[PDB]
Design an enzyme around this catalytic site. Sequence first.
Site, mmCIF file in Angstrom:
data_model
loop_
_atom_site.group_PDB
_atom_site.id
_atom_site.type_symbol
_atom_site.label_atom_id
_atom_site.label_comp_id
_atom_site.label_asym_id
_atom_site.label_seq_id
_atom_site.Cartn_x
_atom_site.Cartn_y
_atom_site.Cartn_z
ATOM 1 C CB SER A 55 -10.133 -6.984 -23.553
ATOM 2 O OG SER A 55 -9.531 -8.233 -23.857
ATOM 3 C CD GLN A 56 -16.189 -11.581 -20.489
ATOM 4 O OE1 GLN A 56 -17.006 -11.058 -21.248
ATOM 5 N NE2 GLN A 56 -16.549 -12.247 -19.395
ATOM 6 N N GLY A 57 -11.345 -11.842 -20.872
ATOM 7 C CA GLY A 57 -10.598 -13.086 -20.916
ATOM 8 C C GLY A 57 -11.090 -14.013 -19.827
ATOM 9 C CB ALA A 58 -10.131 -17.278 -18.703
ATOM 10 C CB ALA A 61 -8.986 -9.742 -15.909
ATOM 11 C CB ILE A 62 -14.113 -7.825 -17.602
ATOM 12 C CG1 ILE A 62 -14.754 -9.219 -17.593
ATOM 13 C CG2 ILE A 62 -14.808 -6.937 -18.596
ATOM 14 C CB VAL A 63 -9.724 -4.818 -19.945
ATOM 15 C CG1 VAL A 63 -8.988 -3.482 -20.034
ATOM 16 C CG2 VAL A 63 -8.840 -5.857 -19.290
ATOM 17 C CE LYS A 103 -8.527 22.344 -11.521
ATOM 18 N NZ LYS A 103 -7.901 23.620 -12.002
ATOM 19 C CG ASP A 151 0.022 -14.452 -21.028
ATOM 20 O OD1 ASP A 151 0.237 -15.351 -21.870
ATOM 21 O OD2 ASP A 151 -1.002 -13.729 -21.054
HETATM 22 N N1 AMP Z 1 -2.587 -0.307 -19.787
HETATM 23 C C1 AMP Z 1 -3.259 -0.618 -20.919
HETATM 24 N N2 AMP Z 1 -3.318 0.224 -21.966
HETATM 25 C C2 AMP Z 1 -3.999 -0.064 -23.093
HETATM 26 N N3 AMP Z 1 -4.667 -1.225 -23.259
HETATM 27 C C3 AMP Z 1 -4.688 -2.149 -22.280
HETATM 28 C C4 AMP Z 1 -3.966 -1.904 -21.026
HETATM 29 N N4 AMP Z 1 -4.138 -2.976 -20.242
HETATM 30 C C5 AMP Z 1 -4.916 -3.851 -20.947
HETATM 31 N N5 AMP Z 1 -5.230 -3.357 -22.151
HETATM 32 C C6 AMP Z 1 -6.049 -4.018 -23.183
HETATM 33 O O1 AMP Z 1 -6.843 -5.026 -22.558
HETATM 34 C C7 AMP Z 1 -6.473 -6.327 -23.069
HETATM 35 C C8 AMP Z 1 -6.522 -7.372 -21.968
HETATM 36 O O2 AMP Z 1 -5.637 -6.979 -20.913
HETATM 37 P P1 AMP Z 1 -5.093 -8.006 -19.801
HETATM 38 O O3 AMP Z 1 -6.317 -8.492 -19.039
HETATM 39 O O4 AMP Z 1 -4.109 -7.186 -19.007
HETATM 40 O O5 AMP Z 1 -4.460 -9.120 -20.617
HETATM 41 C C9 AMP Z 1 -5.058 -6.129 -23.604
HETATM 42 O O6 AMP Z 1 -4.689 -7.064 -24.632
HETATM 43 C C10 AMP Z 1 -5.082 -4.718 -24.123
HETATM 44 O O7 AMP Z 1 -5.648 -4.682 -25.439
#
Ligand code: AMP
Lengths: 172, 237
Positions: free
Chosen positions: B20-23, B24-26, B39, B141
Amino acid sequence: MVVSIIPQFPDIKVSLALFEQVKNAKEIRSKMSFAFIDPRLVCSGEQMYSAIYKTLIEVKYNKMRTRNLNSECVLCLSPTSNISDAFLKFGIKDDSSQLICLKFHTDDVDKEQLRTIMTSIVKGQEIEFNDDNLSRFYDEALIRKIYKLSDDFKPQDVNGLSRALVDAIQLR
Amino acid sequence: EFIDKVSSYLTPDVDIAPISQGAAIVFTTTTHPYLPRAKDSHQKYIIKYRPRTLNESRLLAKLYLIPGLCVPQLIACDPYNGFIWLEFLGEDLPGGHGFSNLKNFLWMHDQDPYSDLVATTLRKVGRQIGLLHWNDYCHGDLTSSNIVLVRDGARWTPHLIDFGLGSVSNLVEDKGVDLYVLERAILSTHSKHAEKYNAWIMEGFEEVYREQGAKGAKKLKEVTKRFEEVRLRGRKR
Ligand SMILES: Nc1ncnc2c1ncn2[C@@H]1O[C@H](COP(=O)(O)O)[C@@H](O)[C@H]1O
């Protein structure tokens, strides 16, 4: 004993050993490179490793406060930033009957030599560094006082308690 | 360039997959940030990278300590470079219906939502929001994408994610706006059943407050009144 690496810090090794029936804690303290940590405050490997992680993040990307990585890790176990307080609360005490012996290695570690050195310092019996053994020696009441946990927090198990301690370590 | 910088920071020993990438990248990773290999206890983890990280981490830790509140574990934080490592919550819904957030769960059941499973799950969503607000926290949010369902046998356990815009707050205005954002996010699907979903959520929210005796009852009246005012001020007049 265990020798470990933190994934994003490939060249630093850490050795961890656990001792019980320790007879000479007072002597060790009077002769205080290793960190000697009080297992009464350590409930899990997860908690210990989270502090090793924090130590390396702090030293690489912020500021080292203490003499070396071993001492910095004792500080990183604490919820707060007073160095003397951390050393006192998380370091062994004159009455300690168990200890964790920690050392950072900044080549491959010579394990036989390491075991010989630790045994020349510690009068006690080494046991495996693992969660089964750490679960014998932690003191939940003391942990609650030191990490300032509310009585309303009631984890069902060690994993639950460990998670709160990791939080405190990461946010110090 | 983000990929270069993250993989360099982590080193080649940490696998990453962007999700995922917003306006943070996950990203996801199968590598725990500090436990020795094998472990650890889970198949994968989340890395949230901000090219704020402190605020989110602090809130996740505070909320974990509150009985009944369901949030992901804060595994590691590097506030100097903008990384948070989290527990991975949820899973893929069967039949290609997508990641088990509330939005996808509702879409999957939208043709036939009148079941114990759906009503009970949505009531539990409301309970989470009720606990959050009772304890004077605000999400900031609160969409159907930031509510994640964790499987517990045949049941689902709602968790809250994404506290980037969260805050500590005893303002009823903040509470009403949180509720309104969720209500609107749910309505935005245009589902014929959206009003009922919101009704079930509110049932769960109210239950939490009523469990707090006369004090809870008074506080609930305050919140629901403000919520009604927010709804009024929410559309053209
Ligand atoms: N703890 C988490 N477990 C699973 N998916 C996550 C988690 N945190 C973020 N995501 C995924 O990453 C997207 C963006 O996350 P965020 O930047 O926290 O809005 C979310 O809509 C989820 O699909």
